[PDB]
Each structure stands twice: as structure tokens, then as C-alpha cells.
């Protein structure tokens, strides 16, 4: 499997590289390549100008694959290129504020080597569950990395007193008080005009924690953990469930219209569920599909890993994260059909609940149903189990695996195990989870199963020298996690627990106006959509 990954990365470096500057290329890479033509995936601007999309925030799995490949193979070329790419970004694409030209609304054109902004009214910095490889960055340039992290916090915190964050960060913003800002803890679900989204807080928690890890910065650690704790303090006193957000809308006006869901009318959950469920029916307490993926996977996996790695400095973080996942398993999970039940954090089961009025969560008449636990829950629950072997976390891992065609991992590790060695499962996430189960239990069947998945990944997803989700896909994504999974499998088998970075499920995206072939503008197009297109 190591030879395949080496082949693959060689292929990426051959076909995704800068071919626009003759014999003096930059080290930068295209995000996507059509494996049939070698054509690099382009952003098309309103006038028909074509940029080759180089978004460093959409390449941070590849940086990990590259470093992992070097550690396992002993070939230092891949590690060196990853380092060269970091160095070139600090040299050319880092603002005086410290922010990089990357993320949701900026990238670099590989052709011109100039920064781009595909969304003209949003020339801004955004990171959404990106989880960049700061370990590598600190290794290249510790000071420049620290400047990025301080500038990230400075740009994305609107009000330090109450920790109001923003999804969008302005470039060129002067340094404020930063870690020396005054904080005062507000009560659960205080009413405010702003909104600290969890998928904007995730990258803030992760970055400030890594600045602690590398520079022993007490200010960074304090604020990282304090921000994490904002989604913990308002948790339900009985159930320990929640919360998706920790504020509610400031009500300035009485509503006239169920279907007008503007925040000025007040918390949208209190409007639609409040009459029947009481004052605790609030947006942050709505444990619904998608929202629970953000809370109990996107956030939780990262906090689990941080809690562990922070050691003496992460005990509280880790406690909050494992306690939250345990509560969700206890209250909402159904292992028989592998579903989570829709709920309010106070413990109210909304399964088969008909919405009695229009609102933010659906039109009158909609029946709320249990939803299938996707593999983002498999990786968060298997990671949790690896740190704290609780039967409640096993329950979820077991239920999902069985629903994924993997057989029965047992009533507990090594007990009544009946895994399916003929599985056709080729999911990187399944591979990742099984490795965590193995490392917690030493039960050999779990790793034999992961080997099988790895073999399936190569047989069905290694295509034309790339990794693709389908054989018909137009463009391959150089940030594919298939080789990342294969590497962690190989590092387990070769007895190298330090060679490959624990998985955080980060990813990048690019969002803006994109010109269609007929010349029309498609507003808020994402590279995610481009990668789903077939030939």
C-alpha cells in the first residue's frame, strides 16, 4: 500500500504542479486535476478569465499525507516540498495582519501567482473545519505561524468580552488587545445581535491550542479553552446535552408571520417549538440532523484529539468532550437501525413529531424522523472510545459499523466478534475508526478488517493514478483522504505511531461567483460542487 501512495504523490507532484513559469516554477499545487487530460481545475470569473485554483487551506490533508509518506518511506522529498510550499505562502501570501490568502473566499491563481477573490462582496478570510497542519507550519516558521494565529483571532473575534465571533475576517485589521482582552462570563443563552457559529469557533479553538502546544502561550490556551467552554456551560443540567450555539436572537419586534424567520422576531426555535415544549426550546438546544454533526463530530473529534495532546493542560477539555458524546449516545442513539432521534437538549424526543406551524425548522405538517448516523460519527465515537473505554461510546461504534456492512465488532472489544471479512466497504472514515478501535484493544480482527477496507480503497478508488470517489468523476481532488487512511494503516502495521498525524477530518472549500458555459453567473458556487461533477 506504501508503494501505491508513493506512486500517487509522485503523480500529484507531476500533474498538479506549476507549469506556467517555464523552468522557474513556484512550489504551489493545483487543488484538482482531470486525470484524463492533466487539465488543472479552473475557477471561471465573470469576464471568462480562467484561474487555476490553488487554495492552500484545501491542501492540508495532502500536507499530512506528504509528511507521513516521508516518515514511513524515508524519502525526504515529500516533506521538503510540503515545507517549501509553507515557506512560499509566508513569503508571498501572508498579510501584514498575518492572515493568509486562503480559505473560503481567497485562493492563489497558479497561472499568475496573484491572490484571487471569487466572491466580490466577500474579499475575506474564512476557515470552516479546515484544521490546517500547524505542526508543519511551526516547523518551517514559528514566528510567521504565530502571527497567522494571532491575526486570525484578532480578525474573527468581534467582541472579546462575551466571545462573539464572526465567520468572515477582514484582511488588514490592526492588532487589538488580543489575549489581554477583558472577559466577563454571560449566563446561558443570553440575547444578542451577533452569532458565534460553532463551525467558525472550531478553527479558533484548534489554532490557539496549537499556539499553546508550540510556544507555551498561556493567553492562547486560556482563550481556546474558554471558547470551547461556551458550548459546554449552557448544557442541560439533567441530560448533559447541547449546545449548537450559546446565545439567542435579540428580539426587537413582535412577529406577524410564521414563515418570516428573521432573527429580529426572536429565537426561531422558541417560536416554532416554544408553545408546546416550553422556554428551553431554543436554537442552541435543537439536537437535530446536521446540527449534531457539527457538535458531536466536527467539533468533538478535534477536541478529543486536543484534550489528549494537551496532556496536563487538556484534562477539562477532554472531560467536556467525552461527557457530551456519552450523553448523546445515552439519550438519542438507536443501535437497531443506527439512527439518532431528533431531540431538544432537555430530553424531549421529537421522533414522529408533526410541526404544528411554519418556521425555521420546516413547514406546517412536516414529520420529524430519526436520521441515520453517518461515518462522521464513526470516527468521533471510535476516537472517544480509544481515549475512554466507555460502553456508551462502544454502542455507537458498533451500531454504525453493522450498518456499514462491516459485521459485528462485538458486545465489547474481543467479545462475540463477527466482522465481515468479505466487506466491499471502501470508506476512508471506516478505515480510520477501526484503527482507533484496534489501538485501544489490540484485537487483531479490527485491523484485519481495516486492511480489507484499504485493499478495497486501492481496487475501486485508485484510478488513473489518482484517488477519486467515482470512476466517472471529472476532476480528482489532491486533498483526497484515501491515501491519508492508507498511510495510517501502514504506520500501524509498521509499528510507527508517530509517523502519520491523527485524523481531524479537516477539509478546505472555495466559494464565490462562477461563470457557467452560457456566460451566466452562478452565485455562491463551491469547489465542492465542481468535484462532484462527472465526465
Under the rule (CB under 5 A), what is the footprint of Mn ion?
104, 126
Q: Which is nearer to Mn ion, 156 or 447 (CB)?
A: 156
Least spacing, CB of residue 161 vs Mn ion, in Å: 25
Least spacing, CB of residue 209 vs Mn ion, in Å: 24
Q: Which is nearer to Mn ion, 104 or 132 (CB)?
A: 104
Helix (H) or strand (E) holding 32: strand 32-33
Contact (Cβ atoms closer than 8 angstroms) between residue 32 and residue 527: yes
Least spacing, CB of residue 523 vs Mn ion, in Å: 12
Least spacing, CB of residue 173 vs Mn ion, in Å: 17
Helix (H) or strand (E) holding 6: helix 2-15
Contact (Cβ atoms closer than 8 angstroms) between residue 527 and residue 31: yes
Q: Which is nearer to Mn ion, 34 or 95 (CB)?
A: 95
Contact (Cβ atoms closer than 8 angstroms) between residue 212 and residue 179: no
Contact (Cβ atoms closer than 8 angstroms) between residue 475 and residue 466: no
Q: Which is nearer to Mn ion, 385 or 514 (CB)?
A: 514
Least spacing, CB of residue 128 vs Mn ion, in Å: 8
Least spacing, CB of residue 104 vs Mn ion, in Å: 5
Contact (Cβ atoms closer than 8 angstroms) between residue 368 and residue 343: no
Least spacing, CB of residue 165 vs Mn ion, in Å: 13
Q: Which is nearer to Mn ion, 104 or 370 (CB)?
A: 104
State how far the Cα of 6 lies from the Cα of 9, in Å rounded to an integer.
5
* Cα 432–Cα 435–Cα 438 angle in degrees, nearest 5: 155
Conformational region of residue 229, where left means phi above 0, alpha means psi within -120 to 50, and beta covers everything else: alpha
Q: Which is nearer to Mn ion, 35 or 104 (CB)?
A: 104
State how far the Cα of 365 lies from the Cα of 348, in Å rounded to an integer.
19
Least spacing, CB of residue 55 vs Mn ion, in Å: 14
Q: Where are the alpha helices (DSSP H) in 181-335?
A: 198-215, 218-229, 268-277, 291-293, 300-309, 315-332
Q: Which is nearer to Mn ion, 483 or 512 (CB)?
A: 512
Contact (Cβ atoms closer than 8 angstroms) between residue 190 and residue 291: no
DSSP 3-state of 109:
strand
Question: Would you tell me how many other CB atoms lie within 10 Å of the CB of residue 18?
Answer: 19
Burial class of residue 309, CB neighbours in 10 A (0-12, 13-18, 19+) = middle
State how far the Cα of 302 lies from the Cα of 201, in Å rounded to an integer.
12
Least spacing, CB of residue 194 vs Mn ion, in Å: 15
State how far the Cα of 385 lies from the Cα of 439, in Å rounded to an integer.
10
Q: Which is nearer to Mn ion, 132 or 314 (CB)?
A: 132
DSSP 3-state of 415:
strand
Least spacing, CB of residue 99 vs Mn ion, in Å: 14
Q: Which is nearer to Mn ion, 116 or 126 (CB)?
A: 126
Contact (Cβ atoms closer than 8 angstroms) between residue 364 and residue 358: yes
Q: Which is nearer to Mn ion, 104 or 115 (CB)?
A: 104
Amino acid at each position: 500500500r506504501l508503494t501505491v501512495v508513493k506512486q500517487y504523490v509522485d503523480n500529484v507532484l507531476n500533474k498538479a504542479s506549476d507549469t506556467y513559469h517555464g523552468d522557474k516554477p513556484s512550489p504551489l499545487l493545483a487543488d484538482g486535476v482531470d486525470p484524463r487530460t492533466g487539465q488543472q481545475l479552473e475557477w471561471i470569473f465573470p469576464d471568462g478569465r480562467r484561474a487555476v485554483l490553488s487554495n492552500f487551506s484545501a491542501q492540508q490533508n495532502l500536507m499530512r499525507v506528504m509528511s507521513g509518506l516521508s516518515q514511513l518511506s524515508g524519502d525526504p522529498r515529500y516533506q521538503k516540498r510540503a515545507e517549501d510550499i509553507v515557506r512560499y505562502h509566508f513569503q508571498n501570501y501572508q498579510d501584514p495582519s498575518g492572515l493568509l490568502y486562503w480559505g473560503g473566499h481567497r485562493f492563489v491563481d497558479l497561472k499568475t501567482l496573484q491572490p484571487e477573490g471569487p466572491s466580490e462582496k466577500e474579499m475575506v478570510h474564512e476557515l470552516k473545519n479546515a484544521y490546517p497542519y500547524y505542526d508543519l507550519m511551526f516547523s518551517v516558521d514559528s514566528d510567521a505561524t504565530a502571527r497567522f494565529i494571532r491575526g486570525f483571532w484578532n480578525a474573527h473575534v468581534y467582541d472579546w468580552r462575551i466571545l462573539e465571533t464572526s465567520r468572515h475576517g477582514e484582511y488588514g485589521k490592526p492588532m487589538g488587545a488580543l489575549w489581554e482582552s477583558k472577559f466577563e462570563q454571560q449566563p446561558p443563552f443570553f440575547a444578542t445581535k451577533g452569532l458565534s457559529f460553532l463551525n467558525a469557533g472550531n478553527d479558533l479553538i484548534y489554532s490557539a491550542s496549537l499556539l499553546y502546544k508550540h510556544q507555551q502561550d498561556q493567553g492562547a490556551l486560556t482563550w481556546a479553552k474558554r471558547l470551547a467552554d461556551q458550548y459546554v456551560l449552557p448544557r442541560d443540567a439533567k441530560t448533559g446535552l447541547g449546545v449548537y450555539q450559546f446565545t439567542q436572537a435579540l428580539k426587537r419586534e413582535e412577529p406577524t408571520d410564521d414563515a418570516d424567520t428573521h432573527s429580529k422576531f426572536g429565537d426561531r426555535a422558541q417560536r416554532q417549538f416554544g408553545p408546546e415544549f416550553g422556554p428551553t426550546a431554543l436554537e442552541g438546544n435543537m439536537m437535530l440532523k446536521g446540527r449534531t454533526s457539527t457538535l458531536y463530530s466536527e467539533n468533538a473529534l478535534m477536541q478529543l484529539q486536543l484534550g489528549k495532546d494537551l496532556g496536563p493542560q487538556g484534562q477539562d477539555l477532554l472531560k467536556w468532550t467525552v461527557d457530551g458524546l456519552k450523553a448523546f449516545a445515552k439519550y438519542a442513539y438507536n443501535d437497531q437501525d443506527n439512527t439518532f432521534r431528533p431531540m431538544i437538549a432537555n430530553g424531549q424526543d421529537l421522533s414522529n413529531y408533526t410541526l404544528p406551524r411554519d418556521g425555521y425548522y420546516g413547514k406546517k405538517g412536516t414529520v420529524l424522523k430519526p436520521y441515520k448516523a453517518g461515518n462522521e460519527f464513526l470516527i468521533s465515537y471510535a476516537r472517544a472510545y480509544a481515549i475512554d473505554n466507555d460502553p456508551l461510546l462502544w454502542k455507537v461504534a458498533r451500531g454504525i459499523a453493522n450498518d456499514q456492512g462491516l459485521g459485528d465488532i462485538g458486545t465489547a472489544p474481543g467479545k462475540e466478534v463477527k466482522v465481515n471479512m468479505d466487506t466491499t466497504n471502501s470508506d476512508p472514515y471506516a478505515l480510520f475508526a477501526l484503527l482507533d478501535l484496534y489501538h485501544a484493544s489490540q484485537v487483531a480482527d479490527y485491523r484485519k478488517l481495516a486492511e480489507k477496507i484499504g485493499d478495497n480503497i486501492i481496487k475501486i478508488r485508485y484510478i488513473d493514478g489518482f484517488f477519486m470517489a467515482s470512476s466517472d468523476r471529472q476532476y480528482a481532488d489532491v486533498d483526497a483522504i484515501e491515501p491519508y487512511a492508507l498511510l495510517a494503516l501502514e504506520a500501524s502495521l509498521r509499528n510507527k505511531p508517530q509517523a502519520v498525524a491523527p485524523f481531524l477530518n479537516g477539509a478546505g472549500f472555495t466559494e464565490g461567483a462562477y461563470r457557467m458555459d452560457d456566460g451566466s453567473a452562478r452565485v455562491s458556487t463551491r469547489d465542492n460542487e465542481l468535484f462532484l461533477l462527472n465526465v
